[PDB]
Amino acid sequence: EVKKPAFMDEEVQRILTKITGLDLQKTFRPAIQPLKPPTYKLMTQAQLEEATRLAVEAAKVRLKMPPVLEERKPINDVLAEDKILEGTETNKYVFTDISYNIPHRERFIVVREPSGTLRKASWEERDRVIQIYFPKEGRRVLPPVIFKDENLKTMYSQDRHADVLNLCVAQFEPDSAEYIKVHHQTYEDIDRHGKYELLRSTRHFGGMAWYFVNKKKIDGLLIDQIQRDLVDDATSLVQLYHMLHPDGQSAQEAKEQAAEGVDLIKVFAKTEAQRGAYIELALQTYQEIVTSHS
Amino acid sequence: KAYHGGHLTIRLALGGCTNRPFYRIVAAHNKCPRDGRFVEQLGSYDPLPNSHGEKLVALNLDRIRHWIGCGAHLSKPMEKLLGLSGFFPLHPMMITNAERLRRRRAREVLLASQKAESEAKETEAS
Amino acid sequence: PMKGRFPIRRTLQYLGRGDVVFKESVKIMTVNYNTYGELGEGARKFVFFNIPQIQYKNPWVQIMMFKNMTPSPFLRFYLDSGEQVLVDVETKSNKEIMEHIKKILGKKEETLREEELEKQQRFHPGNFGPRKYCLRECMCEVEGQVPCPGLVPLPKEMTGKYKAALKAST
Amino acid sequence: RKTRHDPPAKSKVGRVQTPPAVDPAEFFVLTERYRQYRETVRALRLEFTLEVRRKLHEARAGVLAERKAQQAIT
Amino acid sequence: RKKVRPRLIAELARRVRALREQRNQPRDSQLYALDYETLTRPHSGRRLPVRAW
Amino acid sequence: ICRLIGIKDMYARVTGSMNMLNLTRGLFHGLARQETHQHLADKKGLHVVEFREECGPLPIVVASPHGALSKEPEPEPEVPDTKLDWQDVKAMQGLKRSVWFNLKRPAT
Amino acid sequence: SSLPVSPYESEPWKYLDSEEYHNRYGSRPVWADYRRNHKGGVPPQRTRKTCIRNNKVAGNPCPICRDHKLHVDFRNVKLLEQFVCAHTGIIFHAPYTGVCMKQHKKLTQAIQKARECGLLSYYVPQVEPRDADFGTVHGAVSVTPPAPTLLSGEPWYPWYSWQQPPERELSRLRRLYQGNLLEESGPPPESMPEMPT
Amino acid sequence: PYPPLLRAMILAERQKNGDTSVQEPLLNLERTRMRPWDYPAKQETKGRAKGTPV
RNA sequence: AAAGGUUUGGUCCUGGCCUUAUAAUUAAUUAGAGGUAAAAUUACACAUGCAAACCUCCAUAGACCGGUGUAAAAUCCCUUAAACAUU
Ligand code: FES
Ligand SMILES: [K+]
Ligand SMILES: [Mg+2]
Ligand SMILES: [Mg+2]
Ligand SMILES: [Mg+2]
Ligand SMILES: [Mg+2]
Ligand SMILES: [Mg+2]
Ligand SMILES: [Zn+2]
């Protein structure tokens, strides 16, 4: 079977990086944090261009996309059932192995319940206790209150989606249900309000386009990419959609006509586009502006 | 102090404040003060239920195994913790005490039934 | 104004810029240089600029310097095995001398990194204790755990004063 | 706590031991639990003692230990 | 340093004390004698435990 | 004087004599003989670039030479011969400051 | 004993947009035109504990206390912004604005609560995921093969359960501790008896 | 058998190292067998009481 | 230190003293409750009670915990060897 493309596939990372874009001014926007007096260097045009190159190298490492994973499966394993200890304790004991050189997902965290059952700690219990003994800067032991739907909607009204996602990465694990819930809610709000520009030149753009492709709702991103004159991006998105859905009518139509460039986007409109009429209109208007002006 | 004689032991060192106990599992020479000089800290024990109702024990099982392999004795409270965790077998007195509690509650239940039967006799008298 | 010439040499940041960390075999480094001449200029700068940095990173190595004893400047290292490594530094820049000694008798970056990690093996984040040694002194500081009675009064039922009263009442 | 050179208390001259009373059924069961419990813990303490000595020998004279020593000399 | 000075009395005391112990060693007939009326050892005045009476 | 000029963020230390006239004459003397970034680019012919720790490695060009940009890199000595003030350096050497230093004060 | 009653108690944010606020304060912070009265040039490192005691106001009420309509609430973000550094995002210490220690604590809690609910913006650093590897196939997070005793339902070790002593051994103990014995106990209840209530 | 947690840690290590087996970890008690508590002890190394009378 | 006050008929320089900040003890005046921490004139003399036992005899322990800052430039850090009244 032809393997389903992955998020980390070298081809997917190429396309997702391209559509995301780069902007040294947005990637290195000044942080509102304690400040220090700036330093100054006299540089030639050769040295200045070299410095810009290193800045673009850092912007690449800065824009590294966070993992997109499937929801973890509940841990429900009972190590022992010592019924002799039933009724001798009122509160659960949680035992955490805190050996330094063990990966956190390979640590043994067990719970001795009042009934006497010795079981493995659940996912929510595992993450809480690992914060208490291996604290991570940015993460809190108890789930914050900013992730509540009412609080999240407030952040969306202020157009603070990149923060909602940066907070979701410091707090929750990539495979946790809360992580997937918050990300899918942020991506969904961007679509309805056409706020795709907020996450451009950010590490969160790749996951957003991935989510739309898998959910077959790239229509809005194509319309918005075209209206911003980013039609190379729109074509690459249609390539990614024809890669993760090979047996789709749209992918089979592009093979029949050997479509390339702007042709690929036109094929998508007729075949699988939820709102094909608008993609053609925006694509047509773009062609008219380009042809008329140049 | 300059001790002469004694052995290394794994025990609980009491910390915290009044009515708020907190324990540090440590490996220390047995003659040292309870909260004084130790060799290594091997974990912690919080005996008070937290917001989720969980008493939290942390055990550095790699260092604990190291010090038991070098002759370190265990205090009876620490042997009870290792038994509840599953790293050691349940201590004999953990089982015996649980059996005593079972025999003691059986008497209480029987006495209540006898009292209820005596109360039933009062109901019969009316 | 800091006294002397090139007062930057007497700053901790400058002293820490030295990169030559000798191998454990190195025990002594005798420096023979001439105060007058043209082919010994690099050696004079090496004594002026580099010897402080070398000593700072190698506190246990004996650096003894001799002046105007030979026609040409040279460096001779004495190793613990008994070997003597002679280096000729005439017509060589001070930077060139530092790079030469680093190659032949300097520890590699990989070796130095491993030692740093080993030094910190016994520090654990989960460990509780004084600020000098640990992040948190008590579990009361942790979020969700019962707070310290001093900061937050405990519930009456969790207090010995209250419990003792009930036992008398019983 | 008192030193060996301190005088004994006068309120405690009368003291004599009062050994606890023994339940035959539970005393015997408990004696067997201690024997079997201490056997298991001695087997585990021995296994822990071997991991300590194995790990120490690997570091002192393991494959990796020997190669690095000659690599430095070369 | 060099202001730490010998302690002749301390050295003399240790040796002298140890010698007396060897000279005046007790015998089993004295250390383990017993008074059967009180079940107490006369040497040390150590009363035997109850389960041994 | 700084409020009269419009300077909002600065540090200064005054030592020696506290003569008010000499402090005002010396203050204006120094503030009027400073060198703007645009001036420095013209004198040396090179770009003046700025590196902020809150902006990462992003190079910020604050002044470009008015005429011809040079191609000879400015000499960077291995060890500079700058004359350093003990007062500035002493802090970074880990020496304890006075109890009067950096006290909490009202907004200026 | 009659402190004035603010009309904006329910909606504190309204005051900061009203014409009355603009006339009194303009576009400068509410602490701009406040000065503290103290001996010496170096001021005390703490401000006064509180400006209001039992409906009485102190001589020089602090910026918050002097204006009763000003309300320190997490929803009144425009007021809270004035007490946070725009460039560094650090809350100013009490001497900086001259607020009393009581209101400074109240302001700090309101700012912290406003940030937690997202009403007041702050800088979120970018942090990498916790784990280098995200596999969940280790036994700790997976299913361990059930032990033979667990499948059968037996105790983990045989001595965990009560094993009736042999009759000869019970007699051996009755002789050894003759005269200091307790009533012999039989097998304990199979389960924990439900607590009588 | 091994204690419940210590048995799970052994089986988990097996899978990590690629050792595939359903063998049950077992402790060997032969090497560490305890004498009875009343077993005669070594008199040669035992202490003797001092010669100071009370 | 972000400094200020004070030499003179007056100015500049030099220079000390003092003020403003922070904390501990004692004292004057004054004082509701609750939680927590700490408790401290004195190596001067001490009434009284208690602070080390356990345990089938042998042994083990009372060499610890607790207290004070006597003596002493007394030490820190490091190397080597050796035992251990030990496990
Ligand atoms: S310091 Fe943690 S309970 Fe008080
Ligand atoms: K003066
Ligand atoms: Mg015996
Ligand atoms: Mg004069
Ligand atoms: Mg007083
Ligand atoms: Mg002590
Ligand atoms: Mg003295
Ligand atoms: Zn106030």
Coordinates of all heavy atoms in Angstrom, one line a residue, chain D residues 1-7 9-12 15 17 19, chain I residues 48-56 62-66:
Chain D
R1 N 19.7 12.9 76.0 CA 19.6 11.5 76.6 C 20.7 11.3 77.6 O 21.8 11.8 77.4 CB 19.6 10.4 75.5 CG 18.3 10.4 74.7 CD 18.2 9.2 73.9 NE 17.5 8.1 74.6 CZ 17.4 6.8 74.2 NH1 17.8 6.5 73.0 NH2 16.8 5.9 74.9
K2 N 20.5 10.6 78.7 CA 21.4 10.4 79.7 C 22.7 9.7 79.2 O 22.7 9.0 78.2 CB 20.8 9.5 80.9 CG 19.5 10.0 81.4 CD 19.4 9.6 82.9 CE 17.9 9.4 83.2 NZ 17.7 9.1 84.7
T3 N 23.8 9.9 79.9 CA 25.0 9.2 79.7 C 25.1 8.0 80.6 O 24.4 7.9 81.6 CB 26.2 10.1 79.9 OG1 26.3 10.5 81.3 CG2 26.1 11.4 79.1
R4 N 26.1 7.1 80.3 CA 26.3 5.9 81.2 C 26.7 6.3 82.6 O 26.6 5.5 83.5 CB 27.3 5.0 80.5 CG 28.7 5.5 80.3 CD 29.5 4.6 79.5 NE 29.0 4.6 78.1 CZ 29.1 3.6 77.2 NH1 29.8 2.5 77.6 NH2 28.7 3.7 76.0
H5 N 27.3 7.5 82.7 CA 27.8 8.0 84.0 C 26.7 8.7 84.8 O 27.0 9.1 85.9 CB 29.0 8.9 83.8 CG 30.0 8.4 82.9 ND1 30.8 7.3 83.1 CD2 30.3 8.8 81.6 CE1 31.6 7.1 82.1 NE2 31.3 8.0 81.2
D6 N 25.5 8.8 84.3 CA 24.4 9.5 85.0 C 23.8 8.6 86.0 O 23.8 7.3 85.8 CB 23.4 10.1 84.0 CG 23.9 11.3 83.3 OD1 24.7 12.0 83.8 OD2 23.4 11.6 82.2
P7 N 23.2 9.1 87.0 CA 22.5 8.2 88.1 C 21.2 7.8 87.6 O 20.4 8.5 86.9 CB 22.4 9.1 89.3 CG 22.2 10.5 88.7 CD 23.0 10.5 87.4
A9 N 17.1 6.9 87.8 CA 16.0 7.5 88.4 C 15.5 6.7 89.6 O 15.6 5.5 89.6 CB 14.9 7.7 87.5
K10 N 15.0 7.4 90.7 CA 14.5 6.7 91.8 C 13.1 6.3 91.7 O 12.7 5.3 92.3 CB 14.7 7.6 93.1 CG 16.1 8.0 93.3 CD 16.1 9.1 94.4 CE 15.5 10.4 94.0 NZ 16.0 11.5 94.9
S11 N 12.3 7.0 90.9 CA 10.9 6.5 90.6 C 10.9 5.2 89.8 O 9.8 4.6 89.7 CB 10.2 7.6 89.8 OG 9.9 8.7 90.6
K12 N 12.0 4.8 89.3 CA 12.1 3.6 88.4 C 12.9 2.5 88.9 O 13.3 1.6 88.2 CB 12.7 4.1 87.0 CG 11.9 5.2 86.3 CD 12.5 5.7 85.0 CE 13.3 4.6 84.3 NZ 13.8 5.1 83.0
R15 N 10.8 -0.9 88.7 CA 10.4 -1.4 87.3 C 10.9 -2.9 87.2 O 12.0 -3.2 87.5 CB 11.0 -0.6 86.2 CG 10.5 0.8 86.1 CD 10.9 1.4 84.8 NE 10.3 0.7 83.6 CZ 10.7 0.9 82.4 NH1 11.6 1.8 82.0 NH2 10.1 0.2 81.4
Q17 N 10.1 -6.1 84.0 CA 9.5 -6.3 82.6 C 8.1 -6.9 82.8 O 7.8 -7.7 83.7 CB 10.4 -7.2 81.8 CG 10.2 -7.2 80.3 CD 11.0 -8.2 79.6 OE1 11.8 -8.9 80.2 NE2 10.8 -8.3 78.3
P19 N 6.3 -8.7 79.9 CA 6.2 -9.1 78.5 C 4.8 -9.2 78.0 O 3.9 -9.4 78.7 CB 6.9 -10.5 78.6 CG 7.8 -10.5 79.7 CD 7.0 -9.7 80.7
Chain I
rU48 P 18.2 18.3 96.0 OP1 18.2 17.2 97.0 OP2 19.2 18.2 94.9 O5' 16.8 18.3 95.4 C5' 15.6 18.3 96.2 C4' 14.3 18.3 95.4 O4' 14.2 19.6 94.8 C3' 14.3 17.3 94.2 O3' 14.0 16.0 94.6 C2' 13.3 17.9 93.3 O2' 12.0 17.7 93.7 C1' 13.6 19.4 93.5 N1 14.6 19.9 92.5 C2 14.1 20.2 91.2 O2 12.9 20.1 90.9 N3 15.0 20.7 90.3 C4 16.4 20.9 90.6 O4 17.1 21.3 89.7 C5 16.8 20.5 91.9 C6 15.9 20.0 92.8
rG49 P 14.7 14.7 93.9 OP1 14.4 13.5 94.7 OP2 16.0 15.1 93.5 O5' 13.8 14.5 92.5 C5' 12.4 14.1 92.6 C4' 11.7 14.4 91.3 O4' 11.7 15.8 91.0 C3' 12.2 13.7 90.1 O3' 11.9 12.3 90.0 C2' 11.6 14.6 89.0 O2' 10.3 14.3 88.7 C1' 11.8 16.0 89.6 N9 13.0 16.6 89.2 C8 14.2 16.7 90.0 N7 15.2 17.3 89.3 C5 14.6 17.7 88.1 C6 15.2 18.4 87.0 O6 16.3 18.8 86.9 N1 14.3 18.5 86.0 C2 13.0 18.0 86.0 N2 12.3 18.3 84.9 N3 12.4 17.4 87.0 C4 13.3 17.2 88.0
rC50 P 12.9 11.2 89.5 OP1 12.4 9.9 89.8 OP2 14.3 11.6 90.1 O5' 13.0 11.4 87.9 C5' 11.9 11.0 87.1 C4' 11.9 11.8 85.8 O4' 12.1 13.2 86.1 C3' 12.9 11.5 84.8 O3' 12.7 10.3 84.1 C2' 13.0 12.7 84.0 O2' 11.9 12.8 83.1 C1' 12.8 13.8 85.0 N1 14.1 14.3 85.6 C2 14.8 15.1 84.8 O2 14.4 15.5 83.7 N3 16.0 15.6 85.2 C4 16.4 15.2 86.4 N4 17.6 15.7 86.9 C5 15.7 14.3 87.3 C6 14.5 13.9 86.8
rA51 P 13.9 9.4 83.5 OP1 13.3 8.2 82.9 OP2 15.0 9.3 84.5 O5' 14.5 10.3 82.3 C5' 13.7 10.6 81.2 C4' 14.4 11.5 80.2 O4' 14.8 12.7 80.8 C3' 15.7 10.9 79.7 O3' 15.5 9.9 78.6 C2' 16.5 12.1 79.2 O2' 16.1 12.6 78.0 C1' 16.1 13.1 80.3 N9 17.0 13.1 81.4 C8 16.8 12.9 82.8 N7 17.8 13.0 83.5 C5 18.8 13.4 82.7 C6 20.2 13.7 82.9 N6 20.8 13.6 84.1 N1 20.9 14.0 81.8 C2 20.3 14.1 80.6 N3 19.1 13.8 80.3 C4 18.4 13.5 81.4
rA52 P 16.6 8.8 78.3 OP1 18.0 9.5 78.3 OP2 16.2 8.1 77.1 O5' 16.6 7.8 79.5 C5' 15.7 6.7 79.5 C4' 16.5 5.4 79.6 O4' 17.2 5.1 78.4 C3' 17.6 5.4 80.7 O3' 17.8 4.1 81.2 C2' 18.9 5.7 79.9 O2' 20.1 5.3 80.4 C1' 18.6 5.0 78.6 N9 19.3 5.5 77.4 C8 19.8 6.7 77.2 N7 20.4 6.9 76.0 C5 20.2 5.6 75.4 C6 20.6 5.1 74.2 N6 21.3 5.8 73.2 N1 20.3 3.8 73.9 C2 19.7 3.1 74.9 N3 19.3 3.5 76.0 C4 19.6 4.7 76.3
rA53 P 16.8 3.5 82.4 OP1 16.4 4.7 83.3 OP2 17.4 2.3 82.9 O5' 15.5 3.1 81.5 C5' 15.3 1.8 81.0 C4' 15.5 1.8 79.5 O4' 16.9 1.9 79.3 C3' 15.1 0.5 78.9 O3' 13.7 0.4 78.6 C2' 15.9 0.5 77.6 O2' 15.4 1.3 76.6 C1' 17.2 1.1 78.2 N9 18.2 0.1 78.6 C8 18.5 -0.2 79.9 N7 19.4 -1.2 80.1 C5 19.6 -1.6 78.8 C6 20.4 -2.6 78.2 N6 21.2 -3.4 79.0 N1 20.4 -2.8 76.9 C2 19.6 -2.0 76.2 N3 18.8 -1.0 76.5 C4 18.9 -0.9 77.9
rC54 P 12.8 -0.9 79.2 OP1 11.4 -0.5 79.1 OP2 13.5 -1.3 80.4 O5' 13.1 -2.1 78.1 C5' 12.9 -1.8 76.7 C4' 13.8 -2.7 75.9 O4' 15.2 -2.5 76.3 C3' 13.6 -4.2 76.0 O3' 12.6 -4.7 75.2 C2' 15.0 -4.8 75.7 O2' 15.1 -4.9 74.3 C1' 15.9 -3.6 76.2 N1 16.5 -3.9 77.5 C2 17.6 -4.8 77.5 O2 18.0 -5.3 76.5 N3 18.2 -5.1 78.7 C4 17.7 -4.5 79.8 N4 18.3 -4.8 81.0 C5 16.6 -3.7 79.8 C6 16.0 -3.4 78.6
rC55 P 11.6 -5.8 75.8 OP1 10.5 -6.1 74.8 OP2 11.1 -5.4 77.2 O5' 12.5 -7.1 76.0 C5' 13.1 -7.7 74.9 C4' 14.2 -8.7 75.3 O4' 15.2 -7.9 76.0 C3' 13.8 -9.8 76.3 O3' 13.2 -10.9 75.6 C2' 15.1 -10.1 77.0 O2' 15.9 -10.9 76.3 C1' 15.7 -8.7 77.1 N1 15.5 -8.0 78.4 C2 16.3 -8.2 79.4 O2 17.3 -8.9 79.3 N3 16.1 -7.6 80.6 C4 15.0 -6.8 80.7 N4 14.8 -6.2 81.9 C5 14.1 -6.5 79.7 C6 14.4 -7.2 78.5
rU56 P 12.1 -11.7 76.4 OP1 11.3 -12.5 75.3 OP2 11.3 -10.9 77.3 O5' 12.9 -12.8 77.2 C5' 13.9 -13.6 76.6 C4' 14.8 -14.2 77.7 O4' 14.1 -15.2 78.4 C3' 16.0 -14.9 77.1 O3' 17.1 -14.8 78.0 C2' 15.5 -16.4 77.1 O2' 16.6 -17.4 77.1 C1' 14.7 -16.4 78.3 N1 13.6 -17.5 78.3 C2 13.7 -18.6 79.1 O2 14.7 -18.8 79.8 N3 12.7 -19.5 78.9 C4 11.5 -19.3 78.1 O4 10.7 -20.2 78.2 C5 11.5 -18.1 77.4 C6 12.5 -17.3 77.5
rG62 P 26.3 3.4 72.7 OP1 26.6 4.5 71.7 OP2 27.3 2.5 73.2 O5' 25.7 4.1 74.0 C5' 24.5 5.0 73.9 C4' 24.0 5.3 75.3 O4' 23.5 4.1 75.9 C3' 24.9 5.9 76.3 O3' 25.2 7.3 76.1 C2' 24.2 5.5 77.6 O2' 23.1 6.4 77.8 C1' 23.7 4.2 77.3 N9 24.6 3.1 77.7 C8 25.5 2.4 76.9 N7 26.2 1.5 77.6 C5 25.8 1.7 78.9 C6 26.3 1.1 80.1 O6 27.1 0.2 80.2 N1 25.6 1.6 81.2 C2 24.6 2.6 81.2 N2 24.1 3.0 82.4 N3 24.2 3.2 80.1 C4 24.8 2.7 79.0
rA63 P 26.6 7.8 76.5 OP1 27.0 7.4 77.9 OP2 26.6 9.3 76.2 O5' 27.6 7.1 75.5 C5' 27.5 7.2 74.1 C4' 28.7 7.8 73.4 O4' 29.8 6.9 73.6 C3' 28.6 8.0 71.9 O3' 29.3 9.2 71.5 C2' 29.3 6.8 71.4 O2' 29.8 6.9 70.1 C1' 30.4 6.6 72.4 N9 30.9 5.3 72.5 C8 30.3 4.1 72.4 N7 31.1 3.0 72.5 C5 32.3 3.6 72.6 C6 33.6 3.0 72.8 N6 33.8 1.7 72.8 N1 34.7 3.8 72.9 C2 34.4 5.1 72.9 N3 33.3 5.8 72.8 C4 32.3 4.9 72.6
rC64 P 28.6 10.6 71.6 OP1 29.5 11.6 70.9 OP2 28.1 10.9 73.0 O5' 27.3 10.5 70.7 C5' 27.4 10.0 69.3 C4' 26.1 9.5 68.8 O4' 25.6 8.5 69.6 C3' 25.0 10.6 68.7 O3' 25.1 11.4 67.6 C2' 23.8 9.7 68.8 O2' 23.4 9.2 67.5 C1' 24.2 8.6 69.7 N1 23.8 8.7 71.1 C2 22.5 8.5 71.4 O2 21.7 8.2 70.6 N3 22.1 8.7 72.7 C4 23.0 9.0 73.7 N4 22.6 9.2 74.9 C5 24.3 9.2 73.3 C6 24.7 9.1 72.1
rC65 P 25.0 13.0 67.7 OP1 25.2 13.6 66.4 OP2 25.8 13.4 68.8 O5' 23.4 13.2 68.1 C5' 22.4 12.8 67.2 C4' 21.1 12.8 67.9 O4' 21.1 11.8 69.0 C3' 20.7 14.1 68.6 O3' 20.1 15.1 67.8 C2' 19.7 13.7 69.7 O2' 18.4 13.4 69.2 C1' 20.4 12.3 70.1 N1 21.3 12.4 71.2 C2 20.8 12.6 72.5 O2 19.5 12.6 72.6 N3 21.6 12.7 73.6 C4 22.9 12.7 73.4 N4 23.7 12.8 74.4 C5 23.5 12.6 72.1 C6 22.6 12.4 71.0
rG66 P 20.6 16.6 67.8 OP1 19.7 17.4 66.9 OP2 22.1 16.6 67.6 O5' 20.4 17.1 69.3 C5' 19.0 17.2 69.8 C4' 19.1 17.5 71.3 O4' 19.7 16.4 72.0 C3' 19.9 18.7 71.7 O3' 19.2 20.0 71.6 C2' 20.2 18.4 73.2 O2' 19.1 18.6 74.0 C1' 20.4 16.9 73.1 N9 21.9 16.6 72.8 C8 22.4 16.2 71.6 N7 23.7 16.1 71.6 C5 24.0 16.4 72.9 C6 25.3 16.4 73.5 O6 26.4 16.1 73.1 N1 25.2 16.8 74.9 C2 24.0 17.1 75.5 N2 24.2 17.4 76.8 N3 22.9 17.1 75.0 C4 22.9 16.7 73.7

